[PDB]
């Protein structure tokens, strides 16, 4: 993570405008900071949120928000690692998991999605029930 690197990757004008959209008393909540990060095309995890919250609390100044954004960049993100995570659950090595299987994975471990969140994401990705998880991982990284 690095602030200079962040500011070459995303437009600081957007960073500022999004902060102003959500700020109260010159500070932004972690949840709204994560929303903004997502609008900027970044993907914070719960570990990122907890890092910044434990340093600065629930509401971030503009600079603290920039720091939090820098943590969200995740330049080491790698599609192969994501695919191999799903491949682990692919008991028959078919390249497919059903929507129900995917839902169970996504709602049971890690930074669990709600049932509705997982269902909606899977239906948004595919009309068909069998999900090619390689294609799914490639899609979410974009």
């Amino acid at each position: 993570a690095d602030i200079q690197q962040l500011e070459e990757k995303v437009d600081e004008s957007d960073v500022r405008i999004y902060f102003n959209e959500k700020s109260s008393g010159g500070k932004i909540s972690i949840d709204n900071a994560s929303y903004n990060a997502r609008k900027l095309g970044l993907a914070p995890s719960s570990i990122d949120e907890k890092k910044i919250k434990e340093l600065y609390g629930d509401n971030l100044t503009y600079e603290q928000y920039l720091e939090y954004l820098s943590i969200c960049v995740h330049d080491k993100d790698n599609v192969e690692e994501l695919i191999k995570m799903f491949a682990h659950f692919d008991n028959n090595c078919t390249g497919y998991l059903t929507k129900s299987q995917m839902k169970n994975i996504l709602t049971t471990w890690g930074d669990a999605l709600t049932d509705q969140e997982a269902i909606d994401a899977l239906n948004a990705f595919s009309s068909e029930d069998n999900i090619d998880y390689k294609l799914f991982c490639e899609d979410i990284l974009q």
Binding site: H74, L106, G110, D111, A121, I140
Partner: peptide, 18 residues
Amino acid sequence: KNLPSLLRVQAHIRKKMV
């Protein structure tokens, strides 16, 4: 099994949702 990678998957899903 591969928890950090699952967390990255979930993070990108939340990003896509927004």
